[PDB]
């Protein structure tokens, strides 16, 4: 923001602004499950279908 306006005291003063920043790094995520193939092959019921 610009500095607030003030009454001139006799000699004007140079002021400065304040700028900042913010950084965020990506993160890597994982989720996995292992199942024996014979169970899927022997899945006539269909229990593992909604996996």
């Amino acid at each position: 923001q610009f500095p607030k306006l003030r009454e001139w005291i006799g000699q004007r003063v140079i002021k400065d602004m304040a700028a900042q920043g913010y950084q965020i790094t990506n993160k890597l995520f994982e989720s996995t499950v292992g199942v024996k193939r014979t169970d899927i092959e022997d899945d006539n019921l269909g229990v593992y279908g909604p996996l």
Partner: protein
């Protein structure tokens, strides 16, 4: 005039069926708390995945 009280005094009546079905029974409600799952054998086994 004179007659046995087991024939005229018995047959001087008119049967009516107003009293039939005068009251009722509580309405069906199990639909609001249960689903209908038809079965085709002795028992039903249920299985769902986690």
């Amino acid at each position: 005039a004179i007659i046995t009280p087991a024939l005229i005094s018995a047959l001087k009546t008119s049967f009516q069926k107003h009293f039939q079905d005068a009251l009722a029974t509580a309405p069906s409600t199990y639909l609001q708390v249960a689903t209908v799952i038809p079965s085709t054998t002795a028992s039903n086994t249920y299985g769902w995945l986690g």
